[PDB]
Amino acid sequence: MNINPYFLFIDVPIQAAISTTFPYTGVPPYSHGTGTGYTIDTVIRTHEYSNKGKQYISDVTGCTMVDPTNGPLPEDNEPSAYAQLDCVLEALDRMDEEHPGLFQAASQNAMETLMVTTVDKLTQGRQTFDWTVCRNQPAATALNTTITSFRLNDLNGADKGGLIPFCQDIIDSLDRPEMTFFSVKNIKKKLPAKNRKGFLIKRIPMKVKDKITKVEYIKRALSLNTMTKDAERGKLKRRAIATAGIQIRGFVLVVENLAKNICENLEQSGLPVGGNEKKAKLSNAVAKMLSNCPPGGISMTVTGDNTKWNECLNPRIFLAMTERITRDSPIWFRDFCSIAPVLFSNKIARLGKGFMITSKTKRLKAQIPCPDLFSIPLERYNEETRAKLKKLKPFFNEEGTASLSPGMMMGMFNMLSTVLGVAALGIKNIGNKEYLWDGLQSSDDFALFVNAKDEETCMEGINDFYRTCKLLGINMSKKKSYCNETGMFEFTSMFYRDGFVSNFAMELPSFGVAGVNESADMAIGMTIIKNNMINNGMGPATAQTAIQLFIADYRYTYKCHRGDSKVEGKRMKIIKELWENTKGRDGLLVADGGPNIYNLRNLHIPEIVLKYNLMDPEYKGRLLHPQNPFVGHLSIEGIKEADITKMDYDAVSGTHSWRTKRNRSILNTDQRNMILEEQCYAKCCNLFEACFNSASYRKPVGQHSMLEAMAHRLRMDARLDYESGRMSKDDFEKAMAHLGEIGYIGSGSGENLYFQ
Amino acid sequence: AMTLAKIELLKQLLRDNEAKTVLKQTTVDQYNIIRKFNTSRIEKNPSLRMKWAMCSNFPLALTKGDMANRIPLEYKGIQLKTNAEDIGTKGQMCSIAAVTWWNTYGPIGDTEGFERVYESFFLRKMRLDNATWGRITFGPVERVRKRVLLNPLTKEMPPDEASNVIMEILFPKEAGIPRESTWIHRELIKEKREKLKGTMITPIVLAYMLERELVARRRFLPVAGATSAEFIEMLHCLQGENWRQIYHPGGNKLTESRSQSMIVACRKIIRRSIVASNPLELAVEIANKTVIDTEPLKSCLAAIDGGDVACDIIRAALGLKIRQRQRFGRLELKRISGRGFKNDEEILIGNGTIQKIGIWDGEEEFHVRCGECRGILKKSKMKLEKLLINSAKKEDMRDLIILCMVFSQDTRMFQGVRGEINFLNRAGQLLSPMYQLQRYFLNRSNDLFDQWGYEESPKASELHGINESMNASDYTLKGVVVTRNVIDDFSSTETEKVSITKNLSLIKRTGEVIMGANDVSELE
Amino acid sequence: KLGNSMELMIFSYNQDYSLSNESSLDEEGKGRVLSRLTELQAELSLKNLWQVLIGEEDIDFKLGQTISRLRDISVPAGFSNFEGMRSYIDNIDPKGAIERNLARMSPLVSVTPKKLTWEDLRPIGPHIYNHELPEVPYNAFLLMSDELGLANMTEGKSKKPKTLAKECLEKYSTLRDQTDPILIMKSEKANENFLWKLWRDCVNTISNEEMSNELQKTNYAKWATGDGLTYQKIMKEVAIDDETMCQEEPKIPNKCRVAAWVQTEMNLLSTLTSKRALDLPEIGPDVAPVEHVGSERRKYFVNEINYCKASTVMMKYVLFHTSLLNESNASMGKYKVIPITNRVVNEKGESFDMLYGLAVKGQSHLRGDTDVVTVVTFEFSSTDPRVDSGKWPKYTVFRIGSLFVSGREKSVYLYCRVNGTNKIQMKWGMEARRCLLQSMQQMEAIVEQESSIQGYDMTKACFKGDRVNSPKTFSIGTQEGKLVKGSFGKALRVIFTKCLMHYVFGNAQLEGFSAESRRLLLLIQALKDRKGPWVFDLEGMYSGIEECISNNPWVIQSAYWFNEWLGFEKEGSKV
RNA sequence: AGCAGAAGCAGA
């Protein structure tokens, strides 16, 4: 008797039992080595689909540019980037008279948003390419480096506060002849070693000053740093993604807020909604298209997907979209929106780290950088790498970068690209023929609903749609997509069967340990179970199991097994003594080797609150000690929100709410100088918070200096503390004298002027 | 007093020339940037990193202080913390055991007031303990994907208002502006003040825990039956796709409390104000000096984003947003496409009388709701081109079809009028043409369906047609369709400012009206 | 605007004030001002004029030379400058353009629609049926169905791993004392002496009085873990002038055919036994009615999985990767020895301890995530490797002794192998318990749907059968060309095994396969319900799937099951 | 050797 798992689908339908098809217990593929090979591949692929158009040289950057827009219409089913401006404009003109007043209103609100939006809004964008150091930094850093850097060139923009004058300086910084900036350089210092050679390169970095020419800076500003995508699911081969510079971000958010303010008032958009709000708004829209099915006629759905979506689009199309969308708005805002496409139109692509060569005989390896990539005979590369480097030649630049006019680099204008895909759906009908189409669009993934008298005519409607998409620079996937009569389909990896079915395996990775800290991960793990009970169709028995499977792994992750068990370990030895000392054992936390009180009924409540009354008075005083040493300085974002792929959880400020070392770093890089840089800002902020108690909660506003304020505040504190009777005349005149100095210190220009 | 100690530390920072130029150059604005500044790399896969580091020797980082030094170096052959001082902080690190030791052998802390600080969480446990659990019932439940409040509040407010409350509680000097509709929670402020006094827990936490019990957490969920927070919190246990569960909570009555009263209060202000002349001027002078419990009605209508119709009418009269939606008696409509010109014309109707009606011209589409049934409308100039609905209550499925046929202004509707239609309201005033036609066709439904006619049903898997009796059929009414698929809730997130007429009708900025006085519910 | 030239005196209408400390304005005057200001603020708000007032305290953006010229070159083809595109887009009328552009486009640009029929759907991946290729080998981390656990009764509480390995080897002394074996089967590039001299050093270091489980840094161990095999980092300037240095042609996964052992694995892992392996900890008291039902359901669901063989295999992988990840960080540069542990309980409720073999840890200076630790696996097994010769090319097998299983003898085989893993797989190993949920959620949904119809808990009815309803029967598999019926609990164990097999052979081939095959599955679902499905490029779908199949066993066996499932649906479709 | 899979790790 032989077993077969696919035979399950005879008794059960596939959509209701789709959870089994996703192997999300298993290991996803990670990035081995460099991503230069894939980066070059995409650089070619992008130019391959646009090579028929006009080639020309940029007089500013001095690079190889390609322009397929208003190019020759293709005569083949291979991918095309050869869009037609005329068509895109008509599609928008069709869309405007369908939703009259939308285009100008979205431009109004996005503008009246911009007028208030401050520089610090840029801080929340995770990864960012820091031009000053040619490395990926975290947003707020790349911002602050650029702010300080700009001040050297006499570009005091961020001081005013608003994003407008900061972005004014960004486009003014491209006019500068010589760009001075703060930068990091390593120092190759030697040390003794007992390893083969007898020495060791301990790389120490420090803060220095570097200069750059106008042209070199523009190239760095227009750059995008590439890498390989880790843990990409549902795909065999690895693909390379990119990251954006800090300059362009300011202009992007304005256009994405505009394209958002369009997509909000569109029924066919699957954006910007998320969670159940999506599931709801979709099921609504599915009905809105089903209803268009005429009398005595068939309704069909195409399971849509686009290949080479980010590669076949073009900034020049998006540039027209803004100039169309903004029609009625004033000039400065129209100029503002036009920038974000332009900087992608003239963008430059970094080529990662580079390839590596070896010799099996002598057992030696060596890294080959991007600048010195061609300084070598081409025969010495392998067969597939040779062909890549051959086609890279003309687009390649001599300082280790590739020019790249077409393409949008693996996602960035996600909203406005949906608007373009929606504008394709906004046509509906061609030639007054016997069909109608509409659909759902969400970035590259779409879903077309075609209605007609019979299904033979539906295919001619699909054929026309496929052909209309080619005119807008959109490539429907013949290889992957398919179609059928209405009933079931796929869309954003959410399946349909007389309603959107629940799918559990998708969310399976989140059930495990989060990786923040003991106290938090606990409440997170249960909140995941709570959400998945409601949203993703998990029953009580599976939920109760999921409780056990979390606590089980939780104990092995954090090494906090039951107090009445003999699992020998370092922490576990102390747990056993705590188990014996305490009388109220049922009140202990799991992190302190306690029992798991959690069950379906009490998931929403936090662990510490459930057990508080059952604790001992001496145990809770330590567990919940106010000035305990493991927390540190708190922020409102740290307690509330957490990272999953963001969401917000609920927990108490316990001793188990602790933080990590500052993730190691790569190599014996002794980052002493740079750690002082971090503390220097911290201490200032920590002193700032003491002067201004709010700070953490209420983001304070002021164009004046931090010191200048702290002086004026600490003055008045003493003024009040003398009158109310907290400080004496001696302590008051102390302060007024001490502060007096601080004033003279804070209005100098160089030394601290010590005295004898 | 701390005051002086700050100044000394500031002077000691101005000795270091790097920190001097930070405080000199960096702005109060930029504070929010430099606080997030770090070196490091944000490492992918933190769950992988946690399991790895937890197995290592000293993964934790420790804050320096007098309390840090009370942790010893070793304990029975176990390394708790490490000496190796980093040159920057002169600081330290520690291991997983260091925390466990602290909870075992560490010092006692003043945990007084802890219950009152995290009160919002403790009220959840109060609800679970005292709650009695009813019977379980296995049966298929149709779950409406509604917008709902996730967590119950002490007092609902918007973020803008609640912040200035939180400020006057914890940071009374820095609060600044004395706002109008903010302080009047002086009962709540003075109450929170005295409760959160003796505790010495970090302010940033107190503020967050106030915000959790003063700010609305409203998300979309699959819901059926009760729509109250103290239920919703337990929703995971109360119901699933294919089962149900009864539940009765701690039972102190919240959320619904104000929502229910605010409805009635507004409705009753209307009924009195309609009669006498200049209803607006009375509706204002009344609602100004009305009260719910302690709050004036202004702050309740503004803070709570619920209401029915009367709420939004009273809102508009006083002067706040209401919601971008359109109502016609019992019918609700949200514009999804198109725009029309209400244009005056002389109209003959079926019975043989000339009524002066305004005619909606142009192609349009609408997301529409009535009671338990929801659907989608498409109309044009005096023509209902298409209508869709979902399987629900037959009383409301009928009303929806009727009310759509009314506002569609279909010629087949106008021709189906028989007899006189002189209807009046409560005050004894003539209803305007279309509000008249509404009540006629709701009453005499059968006269319309015969005049309408029938056509073929659309042959799409999950659709079927209907007839006069509201039953399944291969024939269908010209335009109307029914679907098996379940539809989204009402859904009206965005908000808009509105003006008001003498007769308590609400005018959108364009020129049309959305919420009429006549559209309220009589149910008391 | 004043720096510090004058003393400022700020007064506000709404009762705020800012003054200097050295200033000589008393509380008296401050009042006069602030009172008068508010007195006017009230008289303004009374007669409605407070928002009109403009107080004492109460957009420009243009482009530069560089960015303008960048924009001017960022236009579509044909245009001269940006001002042209702007004024073109704003003032021209594009109506009727799409229709003209569609007309002059070539008809070769089409979707090529073809209606989907059954005879179009040929079997996927024809090369797996061909006998000329070598059959797919056993490339998993540990043994699954071929395992053999050495038993031991214990008091029933946790204990150190070295003490456990010692007591297990103490009982079976016939096997522990073997210093004179017989060689069975060999790998291609392995070494018998070094592998055996390791094993002996493992047994010696485990069975002694000492605490330290560190293995000595021996020359036979240096080869087995891979000492000094890394390529040295020379500088780029030297490599350029060197001619023999090249980029190596990277290895492609070797193409393999179907193997019968994967079928047997699926069969034996799904089969029931008397043992129970799971270590699920306690939960709180069941107060609510739902919690009683969940706990009632768990008793059937959980134990039906727990009894099965896959559950015993799972917990072996978990507790091994749990301890392996710990040792990799605490002792980075030390050759250590780790046992293969798993705790067990049988029907009567008695505590056993299992030992499936040993494992030698290599040098684990792990900085990056992909970095590879090298583990050497020594595992016990009843199976004879000469039965299926193509199954064990990677493994080196020994014959150590015999054991009384119950009545007759059974031959003991020690399976040696040089292996590897990374921090990623070790993490996913610890979190491999969730296979329970993926399978259990699917079957619990079937129960809830059934209970919705009739109106009471159908858990008992589906498993065993009760008064009215018969037992729920799923089509579980095939028997030499015909359909076979199986119970509800068997279907749970089937999916749970499948879920576990996703982790065992989880790599790029699986992810890419299951994604593209899922599309073809949905097309088969459309044919079953009769929805007139259409396809555009059928060979495009197949070409996407076929390249995923190479040397992953579960992929190749899933491809065989898919084609057999497709064939038996064709017969079922005609009726 | 081996993990692995279009390029790396097998201490720097």
In terms of Cα–Cα distance, which of A315, A318, A289 is closest to A419? A318
Same domain membership, residue A381 and residue A427: no
- Per DSSP (E only), the strands in B102-212 are 132-137, 144-149
Rounded Cα–Cα distance for residues A514 and B51 (Å): 10
Given an 8 Å threshold on Cβ–Cβ distance, is A478 in contact with C112? yes
Write out the two tokens for A624: 């919940």
DSSP code string of B433-483: HHHHHHHHHHHS-HHHHHHH-EEEPP--TTEEEE-TTS-EESEEETTEEEE
Instruction: In whole angstroms, give the CA distance from residue A42 to residue A308.
Output: 10
H/E stretch holding C375 reads strand C372-381
Q: Using the CA of A368, give the nucleotide whose C1' is nearest.
A: D7
Q: Is residue A14 part of a domain?
A: no
Strands A364-367 and A396-397, by their bridges, are unpaired
Which residues of chain C make contact with A54, given a CB cutoff of 8 A?
Answer: 77
Nearest nucleotide relative to C372: CA against C1': D9
> How near does any CA of chain A get to the CA of C180, in Å?
36
Q: Which residues of A touch C98 (CB under 8 A)?
A: 86-87, 90-91, 427, 430, 468, 471
- In this complex, which residue's CA is closest to the C1' atom of nucleotide D11? C365
Contacts of A597 in chain C (CB under 8 A): 284
**What's the CA gap between A293 and A287, in Å, rounded?**
10
CA A123 to chain CA mean position, Å: 12
A352 with A439, same domain? no
Same domain, A84 and A148: yes
The percent of chain C in helix, strand and coil, each rounded to the nearest 5, is 45, 15, 40
Q: Distance (Å, rounded) from C-alpha A49 to C-alpha A408?
A: 13
| Structure tokens that stand for A672 in this block | 């002493």
Task: Give the gyration radius of chain C's Cα atoms.
Answer: 36
C456: Cβ contacts below 8 Å, ≥ 6 apart = B138
Residue pair C514/A7 in contact by the 8 Å Cβ criterion: no
Residue the block writes with tokens 């490797």: C385
A302 and A436 co-located in one domain: yes
Residue of chain A nearest C63, judged by CA positions: A171
Give the DSSP letter of residue C231.
Answer: P
Q: Determine whether the distance from the CB of C225 to the nearest atom of strand D is below 7 Å.
A: yes
Resolution of the determined structure in angstroms stands at 4.1
What are residue C358's DSSP bridge partners? C339, C378
Q: What is the full DSSP assignment across A281-336?
A: HHHHHHHHHHTT--TT-EEEEEE--BSSHHHH--HHHHHHHHHHHTTTS-HHHHHH
Same-domain check for residues A40 and A135: yes
Using CB atoms, which chains have 3+ pairs under 8 A with B? A, C
Closest to A343 in 3D by CA, of C72, C70, C75: C70
A30 touches strand D (CB under 7 A): yes
* A500, A528, A557 - which closes a domain: A500
Q: Which of A710, A717, A626 is nearest to B1 (CA)?
A: A717
Which residue of chain C has the CA closest to A506?
A: C438
As for how many domains chain A has, the answer is: 4
Distance between CA atoms of residues C308 and C277, nearest Å: 9
Residue type, B365: E
**538-557 on C, CB < 7 Å from strand D:** 551
**Closest Cα partner for B261 from B317, B226, B224, B301?**
B301
Look up residue A3 and give its amino acid.
I
SS3 A487: coil
For nucleotide D12, the protein residue with its alpha carbon nearest to C1' is A667
Strand partners for A180 = A211
What number of other Cβ atoms are within 10 A of residue A738's Cβ? 16
Query: Rounded CA gap, C109 and C111, in Å?
Result: 7
The answer to whether B152 and B126 are in contact (CB under 8 A) is no
Residue of A291, C332, C324 lying closest to B483 (CA atoms): A291
Q: Which two tokens stand for residue A42?
A: 């995409």
Report the candidate in A452, A116, A349 with the shortest Cα–Cα distance to residue A254. Answer: A116
In the block, tokens 């069967």 appear at A497
Per-residue tokens: A446: 């779409």
The CA distance from A648 to A645, in Å, is 13
Q: How many angstroms separate the CA atoms of A429 and A434, rounded?
A: 9
In a domain, A3, yes or no: no
CA pair distance C312, C343, nearest whole angstrom: 9
Q: How far, CA to CA in Å, does A191 sit from each of A184, A185, A196, A206?
A: 22, 19, 14, 18
The reply to whether C229 Cβ lies less than 7 angstroms from strand D is yes
Give A348-380 as a DSSP string: EEE--S--EEEETTTTEEEE--STTSSSS-GGG
Q: Could you tell me which residues are beta bridge partners of residue B387? A: B377, B480
C55: closest CA among C107, C11, C104? Answer: C11
Helices then strands, counting H and E runs in chain B, come out as 22, 25
Question: CA of C530: which chain B residue's CA is closest?
Answer: B461
Residue A569 CA to residue A567 CA, distance in Å, equals 6
Q: Tokens standing for C218? A: 């021996």
Pairing of the two strands B480-483 and B463-466: antiparallel
| A326 and A380 together in one domain | yes
* A553 and A437 part of one domain: no
Q: Tokens representing A549?
A: 């499977």
Query: Which among B33, C68, B18 has a CA at the least distance from the CA of A166?
Result: B33
Chains with ≥3 CB–CB distances under 8 Å to A: B, C
Across the interface, whether the CB atoms of C94 and A86 are under 8 A apart is answered: yes
φ, ψ for residue A719, nearest 5 deg? -55, -50
Would strands C409-422 and C372-381 be described as parallel, antiparallel, or unpaired?
antiparallel
CA distance A225 to A244: 7
* Domain annotation covers residue A678: yes
Minimal CA–CA distance to A560: which of A587, A590, A588, A582?
Answer: A590
- Residue B174 CA, chain-centre distance (Å), reads 30
Distance (Å) from CA C247 to C1' D10?
19
Furthest-apart CA atoms within chain A: distance in Å = 101
Give a yes or no: residue A115 inside a domain: yes
Among candidate residues B297, B522, B488, the one with its CA nearest the CA of residue B375: B488
**Among candidates B370, B523, B516, which has minimal Cα distance to B442?**
B370
A390 marked among binding-site residues: no
Structure tokens at C51: 């928002």
For residue B45, the chain C residues in CB contact (below 8 A) are 369, 424, 427
C233 touches strand D (CB under 7 A): yes
Which string of DSSP letters, residue by residue, matches C351-392? EEEEEEEEEEE------SSS-EEEEEEEEEE-S-TTSSGGG-
Do A646 and A536 share a structural domain?
yes
Contact C495, C436 (CB under 8 A): no
386-445 in C: which are within 8 Å (CB) of B?
423-424, 426-427, 430-431
> Which long-range contacts (C-beta less than 8 Å, at least 24 apart) are formed by C568-571?
C568/A7, C568/C478, C568/C483, C569/A10, C569/C524, C569/C528, C570/C118
In whole angstroms, how far apart are CA C451 and each of C357, C460, C472?
46, 11, 13
Q: Which residue has the tokens 């964008």?
A: A125
- How many other CB atoms are found less than 10 A from the CB of residue C529? 14
- State in Å, rounded, how far the first CA of chain B is from the last one: 60
Domain that holds residue A728: 661-742
**Is the shortest CB-to-strand distance from A237 to strand D under 7 Å?**
yes
The distance of C365 to chain B (nearest Cα, Å) reads 13
The helix (run of H) or strand (run of E) holding residue A470 is: helix A455-471
Alpha-carbon distance of A16 to B241, in angstroms, equals 13
Half-sphere exposure (Cβ direction) of A287: Cα atoms closer than 13 Å? 31
Give yes or no: residues A616 and A670 share one domain: no
How was this structure determined? It was done by X-ray
CA distance C69 to B303: 51
Contact A93, A99 (CB under 8 A): no
What is the full DSSP assignment across C57-117?
A: --------HHHHHHHHHSSPTT-SSHHHHHHHHHH---TTHHHHHHHHS-TT-S---EE--
- What single letter denotes the amino acid at residue A381? Y
- Strand (E) or helix (H) holding B84: strand B81-86
| β-strand pairing of A127-130 with A135-138 | antiparallel
Cα A522 to Cα A174: distance, rounded to the nearest angstrom = 50
Q: What would the 3-class secondary structure string for B40-66 be?
A: CCCCCCHHHHHHHHHHCCCCEEECCCH
Per-residue tokens: A481: 């997509």
Amino acid identity for residue A568 in this structure = E
d(CA C153, CA C348): 13
Q: Which of A96, A424, A281 is nearest to B339 (CA)?
A: A96
For residue C304, the SS3 value is helix
Residue A69's nearest CA partner among A404, A317, A310 is A317
Q: Determine, yes or no, domain membership for A85.
A: yes
CA B62 to centroid of chain Cα atoms: 42
Place of tokens 């702010």: A147
Token output for B58: 């000293």
How many angstroms is C1' of D6 away from CA of C548?
14
The residue type at A201? I
Within 10 A of A199 (CB to CB), how many other CB atoms are there? 11
Burial class of residue B137, CB neighbours in 10 A (0-12, 13-18, 19+):
middle
A521 is in an annotated binding site: no
On whether the CB atoms of residues C517 and C565 are closer than 8 A, the answer is no
From the number of C-beta atoms within 10 Å of its C-beta (0-12, 13-18, 19+), residue B72 rates as exposed
C-alpha span between A83 and A68 (Å, rounded)? 7
Q: With contact defined as beta carbons under 8 Å apart, do C424 and C373 qualify?
A: no
Last residue of one domain, picked from the residues A638, A660, A682: A660
Q: What is the total residue count of chain C? A: 575
Would the CB atoms of B52 and C452 count as touching at under 8 Å? no
D5 C1' to C252 CA distance, Å:
6
Q: Cβ distance A89 to A348 under 8 Å?
A: no
Tell me which of A617, A636, A660 is where a domain ends.
A660
Task: Give the closest residue to C555 by CA, choosing from C120, C139, C144.
Answer: C139
C364 CB below 7 A from strand D atoms: no
Restricting to C residues 180-219, those with a Cβ less than 8 Å away from any Cβ of A are none
Is A15:A496 a contact under the CB 8 Å cutoff? yes
Ramachandran quadrant class, C476 (left: phi over 0; alpha: psi -120 to 50; beta: rest): alpha
Among partner residues C14, C426, C448, which is closest to B243 by beta-carbon distance? Answer: C448
CA A223 to chain centre: 18
Distance CA C526, CA A718 (A): 79
Residue A185 placed within a domain: yes
* A192 and A236 within one domain: yes
A272 upstream amide cis, omega within 30 of 0: yes
Asked if C74's CB is within 8 angstroms of A315's CB, the reply is yes
- Contact by Cβ (8 Å): A479, A307: yes
Beta-carbon contacts of B67 under 8 Å, excluding residues fewer than 6 positions away, are A625, A627, A628, A629, B107
Question: Closest by alpha carbon to B48, among A256, C205, A663?
Answer: A663
Using a 10 angstrom Cβ sphere, with 0-12 exposed, 13-18 middle and 19 or more buried, the burial of residue B285 is exposed
Q: Do both A211 and A254 map to the same domain? A: yes
> Do A638 and A516 meet the contact criterion of CB atoms below 8 Å apart?
no
Cα distance between the two ends of chain A: 98
A466: exposed, middle or buried (Cβ count in 10 Å: 0-12, 13-18, 19+): buried
Q: Are strands A348-350 and A223-228 parallel, antiparallel or unpaired?
A: parallel
> Do the domain assignments include residue A149?
yes
Give SS3 for A385.
Answer: helix
Say if residue A390 is in the same domain as residue A508.
no
Per the structure block, which two tokens stand in for C210?
Answer: 């000492």
Does the CB of C483 sit below 7 A from strand D? no
Question: Which chain C residues are within 8 Å of B56, Cβ to Cβ?
Answer: 329-330
Structural domain contains residue A374: yes
Distant-in-sequence, close-in-space partners of A622: CB < 8 Å, separation ≥ 6: A655, B102, B103, B104, B106, B107, B108, B109
CA distance B100 to A592: 6
- Quick one: residue C78, left, alpha or beta (phi over 0 = left, psi -120 to 50 = alpha)? left
A to B CB pairs, distance under 8 Å: 483
A362 touches strand D (CB under 7 A): no
Q: Does A552 touch chain B (CB under 8 A)?
A: no
Q: Are A415 and A242 in contact (CB under 8 A)?
A: no
Distance in angstroms (rounded) separating the CA atoms of residues B409 and B434: 9
Cα distances (Å, whole numbers) of residue C142 to C197, C215, C388, C530: 21, 21, 18, 45
The nucleotide minimizing the C1' distance to residue C425's CA is D3
Three-state DSSP class for A162? strand
**3 state DSSP class of C128:** helix
Q: Which of A503, A636, A694, A729 best tests the B interface by mutation, with the highest count of B CBs <10 A? A: A694
Q: Whole-angstrom Cα distance, residue B47 to residue A525?
A: 12
Which amino acid is it at B370? C
CB contact under 8 A, A661 and B114: no
Question: What does the alpha-carbon distance between residue B290 and residue B319 come to, in Å, rounded to a whole number?
Answer: 16
